[PDB]
Design a binder for this molecule. Structure first.
Ligand SMILES: *[C@H](C)C1/C(=C/c2[nH]c(/C=C3N=C(/C=C4\NC(=O)C(CC)=C4C)C(C)=C\3CCC(=O)O)c(CCC(=O)O)c2C)NC(=O)C1C
Ligand SMILES: *[C@H](C)C1/C(=C/c2[nH]c(/C=C3N=C(/C=C4\NC(=O)C(CC)=C4C)C(C)=C\3CCC(=O)O)c(CCC(=O)O)c2C)NC(=O)C1C
Ligand SMILES: *[C@H](C)C1/C(=C/c2[nH]c(/C=C3N=C(/C=C4\NC(=O)C(CC)=C4C)C(C)=C\3CCC(=O)O)c(CCC(=O)O)c2C)NC(=O)C1C
Ligand SMILES: *[C@H](C)[C@H]1/C(=C/c2[nH]c(/C=C3N=C(/C=C4/NC(=O)C(CC)=C4C)C(C)=C\3CCC(=O)O)c(CCC(=O)O)c2C)NC(=O)[C@@H]1C
Ligand SMILES: *[C@H](C)[C@H]1/C(=C/c2[nH]c(/C=C3N=C(/C=C4/NC(=O)C(CC)=C4C)C(C)=C\3CCC(=O)O)c(CCC(=O)O)c2C)NC(=O)[C@@H]1C
Ligand SMILES: *[C@H](C)[C@H]1/C(=C/c2[nH]c(/C=C3N=C(/C=C4/NC(=O)C(CC)=C4C)C(C)=C\3CCC(=O)O)c(CCC(=O)O)c2C)NC(=O)[C@@H]1C
Ligand SMILES: *[C@H](C)[C@H]1/C(=C/c2[nH]c(/C=C3N=C(/C=C4\NC(=O)C(CC)=C4C)C(C)=C\3CCC(=O)O)c(CCC(=O)O)c2C)NC(=O)[C@@H]1C
Ligand SMILES: *[C@H](C)[C@H]1/C(=C/c2[nH]c(/C=C3N=C(/C=C4\NC(=O)C(CC)=C4C)C(C)=C\3CCC(=O)O)c(CCC(=O)O)c2C)NC(=O)[C@@H]1C
Ligand SMILES: *[C@H](C)[C@H]1/C(=C/c2[nH]c(/C=C3N=C(/C=C4\NC(=O)C(CC)=C4C)C(C)=C\3CCC(=O)O)c(CCC(=O)O)c2C)NC(=O)[C@@H]1C
Lengths: 162, 172, 172, 162, 172, 162
């Protein structure tokens, strides 16, 4: 996909040459954050499946109509809510991947490309997701650098959905 | 194109699982020896031309017929083409070291190299022996104790060896 | 691209004969039920999105694994790609109804669709079951007695059925 | 080939969408003339092989040199005249096809494309054909709408040969 | 593209030898009958259209079905296409005579002509019989004693014959 | 490759037509020099392998460092000088080919394309070759027209190396 390492290799390749210092110093900077990022991924790996339900609920408070209105694509039924918690998870799981890779790559190919084309066709609304994501943003309660890297990718996701 | 981190993520997403603890530890390890890794990458870059030139010279002395009249590599147009190609191998082996994954080399370079060379009357086994020789010089430069902080970048070497061999294997 | 009239002309010119009487009568028949034909074409157009969306939903509920992690259709990029494709089938089936000939669909769309899907790890039989489901909803919309002049557009339906089946047959 | 239906499908396809009303109303207009056109095709189907000889003769009056001058590509011989009546036929037969299809399609692909490149190479002259075609134009004696549609395609042919 | 001189050089460079005496004499011979060679080249050019037109006429009279309704060559679009192609053969045969080597014809023209014609429903053997007939007229024009200095351009004729046959052989 | 005949065929081909007079007169001029050129090739064929050593020596006088300096790519060793005489030969042999063909073709494809890319990579210097070539230029002692054609291609070679 698209990691900062990969981005650097593509640049060099298009010129058919080895890495320039600027791109070298650029990559050397990657490894200086890898620890922080990985530490974020470890946090999601554990208390992340839970952050899912937490959001699944909060979103029902902002949008009550989702849990009531006879849903062909709504969480009205108990089986529909089961999917809403799975969807929240996927976003989180994908975001964690970004902390590991150290870039937008995962989000870019797994959930960003072709996002709206799909949603606005199956009747799902971006607002439900955007909201439930902000929840985990504040609530996760991550330290600072591990939180610095974790939050960075959450906002990027919130951006694309807007 | 896929790098070391991207690859592990790739496999985790196929099973739809968060990166297990052990996998975070596997990578933490890679981040640890990163400075050594880049040292290797940088040394190969600097000695690029030197490496390729000698590998050629060693090879001509080996199979001299290949480069004289009638040979698959006669004429400057060809001679320089062969050098260029060896330069290509080294360059992609380097990308492979920096990435810690061998994907770039496979797609961008080794993809259909065996067929190209074949349906072009190039010896193939001679290219393998050229990658082999290039590989010796590469290892000796990258491992030179002089000028670098004394340590053990053993694994890094075993991983360099693997890339070159993977190359030579794909054309022979 | 060839339409119903163009096809009969095509066959007549191969034998170098003027269109026989019976063939003019065959077409006169087509001109007769033309208004019904266009009604069908128009109804499918209007309910396009509705048709495709449900056929997808019915299919996911059928083979849920296909769209979850690991599946050949996971990730939005893919999800939307699959929908897009079903939309393609319906669109060309429509062109086929308006033309009364199936050529457009064959060349512009079904041409190498089986191979594309195959050498791309797509289930194929799952696409057929998607065209099948899309086809049910299509028939029910096009035949709805409400809002149209009461009559018999039976043949038109049998001819719609044929197109969809021809599609599903070409990818399974 | 190129029928008005087909033209409409190509338009829509290039945009990757269904038919626009303008193109719909456009097609709906096709079927409102199909009867007339088909009625023309029926007339040609019968008394058309005869319209061939009729013209084969008239043309000999306008161009006597065609039936005399030692012909390598002239109707001088009786075997050469046999081809002149076949050539007239083909034009007619192709024109009838146009009334069935409701467009220039047949003429466009069967006799128009590569017309002059050929003729002015084998020594055949457009003037012989243009003349013999005008003959059947007036003589056929078609009613009015059946004649309206029939004549429309004859002139188009006369145009391209000029 | 390779010409008579270029070909001999090509073979000499494969063995890395200076052009032997006998080879210089072989070419000296070619330079000798050069004026006759160009005469041949020029005559075919001038009578180009005449040659192609008649070869067509002779062929239609031969296999008349090929050009009537149903035939692989009906319709002006096709008729003119066939003529065009015969014109192509003659043109490249001419280049071949001027060059004294048959390379140009092989690559630029006969390369994949058999397959093209095959996977296009063209008779192939009928094209061969067309090249054959074109060849007769070509020989008769090029050898006409009238208007040229009286001499023996026998070898030149045998070498013309060879080119046409080589063409017809490659499509039949 | 690229002979004057060939050049003319390429021109005509790009237009899909037969040779124009200008190109005809152009080719007819080729055969009027073929004898001279061939006569040059005959001279090289014989006393050319000798012109090789002759130059191999002269060059050592202009560049003594080539025959002394510990050579990884120098004629210091007796085995390295053996290659210098082979390299001189190749140039000559290729040049003779040009007199036969009557153009730059041989030099263009056998030794010109990719010349410098190679040399300035293996550490060989153009100056050694340029010098040793000028030697045979003057020394060969060719008549006049046979010398006219022979020299023409030697200078072209000297040009490209500069
Ligand atoms: C939760 C905010 C609410 C819930 C949403 C909802 N979603 C679906 C169905 C789907 N969800 C997805 C999600 C993904 N699949 C992927 O591959 C990716 C990228 C990794 C995502 C984000 C998809 C593809 C579907 C369609 C197929 C399926 O059914 O799984 C439903 C079911 C309703 C329907 O079939 O249309 C629901 C209900 N509903 C709410 O009201 C929420 C607040
Ligand atoms: C009639 C006006 C006169 C006659 C003309 C004439 N034509 C030919 C030969 C050919 N006629 C055709 C016609 C067609 N073939 C097609 O496929 C189509 C499109 C559907 C057409 C119009 C062709 C292709 C030929 C060439 C091959 C053939 O001989 O059939 C001849 C024969 C003379 C010759 O071989 O050149 C003649 C005489 N001659 C007149 O003087 C007329 C007034
Ligand atoms: C002579 C001026 C001196 C000598 C030069 C030198 N050259 C090499 C090695 C090579 N020479 C060639 C030449 C060609 N091969 C070709 O195909 C063509 C085009 C037809 C040419 C001109 C090549 C390709 C090589 C490299 C492979 C080989 O060794 O044969 C050497 C050997 C040193 C080395 O390996 O780098 C030398 C010494 N040296 C001088 O000092 C000269 C004055
Ligand atoms: C293994 C191949 C050899 C070896 C390497 C080794 N490298 C280090 C530490 C560093 N490597 C650095 C690399 C870069 N990258 C740059 O862009 C750059 C200039 C800005 C440098 C210097 C780097 C910055 C360090 C840290 C500081 C330093 O000591 O150079 C070490 C020490 C242990 C470690 O991994 O940190 C070693 C041992 N040691 C060998 O014995 C092999 C020959
Ligand atoms: C068969 C699918 C259903 C059915 C159809 C049916 N249609 C007609 C007649 C018409 N259809 C028209 C179509 C168009 N196309 C347009 O662009 C347009 C708006 C400008 C229309 C209305 C059309 C103009 C007619 C004629 C007027 C009319 O009655 O609408 C008929 C009647 C018989 C006939 O073929 O003329 C039927 C029966 N009937 C069914 O039972 C099926 C559900
Ligand atoms: C063999 C095909 C026939 C034949 C030819 C023949 N040709 C010559 C000599 C010449 N041919 C010339 C050709 C060109 N090329 C031009 O562009 C051009 C106009 C500027 C000409 C005239 C040419 C210049 C000559 C020399 C002068 C001349 O006599 O025309 C000869 C004579 C012997 C020779 O090879 O020189 C012959 C015999 N003779 C035949 O019997 C064949 C029919
Ligand atoms: C040198 C060790 C050997 C040798 C090599 C040789 N290569 C060519 C020509 C080509 N090489 C390639 C390969 C690549 N092109 C690329 O862009 C990349 C990166 C993805 C690769 C790996 C290709 C495609 C060609 C053909 C096109 C071109 O020339 O650029 C030749 C020329 C063969 C000929 O006669 O045409 C040679 C000789 N030859 C040897 O003898 C050595 C064993
Ligand atoms: C949905 C029912 C199923 C499904 C479909 C799917 N399609 C693709 C990607 C492609 N689909 C096509 C087909 C066409 N492209 C066209 O332009 C036309 C009209 C002539 C057709 C018929 C092509 C060419 C592709 C590849 C290029 C592209 O993506 O546009 C995918 C993606 C497969 C992948 O992982 O790359 C999928 C998944 N997938 C399913 O699971 C359903 C069964
Ligand atoms: C005439 C003797 C016979 C005949 C010929 C015929 N040719 C075509 C169409 C094509 N011909 C070629 C060949 C070439 N194109 C080139 O540019 C060159 C020079 C390198 C050659 C040799 C090609 C490629 C085509 C297809 C593309 C095109 O039409 O230009 C046809 C048409 C077949 C059809 O129905 O499409 C025909 C008929 N046909 C005969 O019956 C004669 C035996």
């Amino acid at each position: 996909m698209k990691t900062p390492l990969t981005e650097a290799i593509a640049a060099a390749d298009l010129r058919g040459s080895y890495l320039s210092n600027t791109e070298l110093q650029a990559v050397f900077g990657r490894f200086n954050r890898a620890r922080a990022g990985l530490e974020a991924a470890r946090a999601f790996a554990n208390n992340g499946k839970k952050w899912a339900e937490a959001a699944a609920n909060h979103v029902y408070q902002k949008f009550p109509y989702t849990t009531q209105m006879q849903g062909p694509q709504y969480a009205s039924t108990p089986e529909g809510k089961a999917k809403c918690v799975r969807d929240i998870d996927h976003y989180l799981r994908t975001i964690s991947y970004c902390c590991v890779v150290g870039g937008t790559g995962p989000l870019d190919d797994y959930v960003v490309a072709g996002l709206k084309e799909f949603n606005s066709a199956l009747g799902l609304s971006p607002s439900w997701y955007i909201a439930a994501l902000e929840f985990v943003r504040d609530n996760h309660g991550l330290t600072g650098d591990v939180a610095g890297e974790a939050n960075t990718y959450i906002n990027y996701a919130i951006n694309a959905l807007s | 194109m896929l790098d070391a981190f991207s690859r592990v993520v790739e496999q985790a997403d196929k099973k739809g699982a968060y990166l297990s603890n052990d996998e975070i530890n596997a990578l933490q390890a890679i981040v640890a020896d990163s400075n050594k890794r880049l040292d290797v990458v940088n040394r190969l870059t600097s000695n690029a031309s030197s490496i390729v030139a000698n590998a050629y010279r060693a090879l001509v002395a080996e199979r001299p017929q290949v480069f004289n009249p009638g040979g698959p590599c006669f004429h400057h147009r060809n001679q320089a083409a062969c050098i260029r190609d060896l330069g290509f191998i080294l360059r992609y082996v380097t990308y492979s070291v920096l990435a810690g994954d061998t994907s770039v080399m496979d797609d961008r370079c080794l993809n259909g190299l065996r067929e190209t060379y074949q349906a072009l009357g190039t010896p193939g086994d001679a290219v393998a022996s050229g990658i082999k020789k290039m590989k010796e010089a590469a290892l000796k430069i990258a491992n030179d104790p002089n000028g670098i902080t004394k340590g053990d970048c053993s694994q890094l070497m075993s991983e360099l060896a693997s890339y070159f061999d993977r190359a030579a294997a794909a054309v022979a």
